[PDB]
Amino acid sequence: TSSLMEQILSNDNLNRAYLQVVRNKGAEGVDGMKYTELKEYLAKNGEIIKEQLRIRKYKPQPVRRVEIPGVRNLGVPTVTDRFIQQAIAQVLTPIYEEQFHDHSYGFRPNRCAQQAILTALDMMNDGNDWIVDIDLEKFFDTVNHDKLMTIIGRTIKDGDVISIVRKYLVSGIMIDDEYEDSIVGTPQGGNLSPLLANIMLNELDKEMEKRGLNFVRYADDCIIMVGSEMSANRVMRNISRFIEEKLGLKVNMTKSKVDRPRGIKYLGFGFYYDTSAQQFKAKPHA
């Protein structure tokens, strides 16, 4: 992973990134450019954009704050930035798919929220029906950028890629969290930020895997299935300590709780016990 930048700027990778970003549509950024205008803009300024990226002279623009229906706050990068973030992710994704845990399902190829529910249900129905529901503050509102770049540097040795990725963290990229309402569809502004959050939280997956914990994770939304109420409280304190001390994230001790499945709301699903099947099952909550 030394000359990774040239793989990102290749003709085929940029063409596929441009097609995916147009297909994803989405609102406009601070420059007001619609996704229907990216084609002619790259045809006239694409080579200059590539040259600016090689010499680390491309300056990403800040994301636009958009209120979306209550209301939801999202950070929308410009369509040019979404195009570049997609070009980076297409190269970084296959590298990190070899490291990621099988029980991580958020914003990954061929993975969705229902798979996480299914795996968690199979764990509950083996006797691990005491749920540790760790609530984290907004990832990109609390992550230390240098902490994240160091973790990325263990695998990515191309400094040009490290430099441009760091700049997009500065731009304010974040995670469209509409999955919490069981919404299915294309997220906004999430070409690169979800992958970055998975690289970070993969350190939590490896720690939980080290301790033999049964868990599923979707972005920064994780639940842990354990066999007793007391070990649940021990796992609760041990993992929350690891999240704050080793990763620098903040555990919301007001929302985090230990509970039975029927008290858990995860990825928009609730949990109930099927008396006929003699198993826990899941369905959307109110």
Provide the binding-site residues for its own copies, judged by CB under 8 A.
23-27, 35, 66-69, 74, 110, 112-115, 117-118, 121-122, 125-126, 178, 181-186, 188, 268-269, 272, 274-284
Q: Which of 221, 240, 249, 282 binds K ion (CB under 5 A)?
A: 221
Q: Does 205 bind K ion (CB under 5 A)?
A: no
Q: Which is nearer to its own copies, 79 or 243 (CB)?
A: 79
How far apart are CB 131 and its own copies at their closest, in Å? 16
Q: Which is nearer to K ion, 5 or 264 (CB)?
A: 264
Contact between 34 and 82 (Cβ < 8 Å)? no
Q: Give the integer Cα–Cα distance in Å for 156 and 110.
A: 24
Choose from its own copies, K ion, none: what does 117 bind? Cβ within 5-8 Å by kind: its own copies
Q: Which is nearer to its own copies, 25 or 56 (CB)?
A: 25
The CA angle 178-34-38, to the nearest 5 degrees, is: 110
Burial of 101 (0-12, 13-18, 19+ CB in 10 A): middle
How far apart are CB 17 and its own copies at their closest, in Å? 17
CA dihedral 20, 217, 257, 255 (to 10 degrees): -20
Length of the chain: 286
Q: Which stretch binds K ion (CB under 5 A): 81-89, 125-133, 175-183, 257-265?
A: 125-133
Contact between 64 and 174 (Cβ < 8 Å)? no
Q: Which is nearer to its own copies, 97 or 274 (CB)?
A: 274
Q: Which residues pair with 251 in a beta bridge?
A: 136
Q: Which is nearer to its own copies, 122 or 259 (CB)?
A: 122
How far apart are CB 59 and its own copies at their closest, in Å? 26
Cα–Cα distances (Å) from 173 to 143, 203, 227, 250, in that order, read 12, 21, 38, 19
CA contacts within 13 A on the Cβ side of 228: 3
Q: Which stretch binds K ion (CB under 5 A): 115-123, 130-138, 161-169, 192-200?
A: 130-138
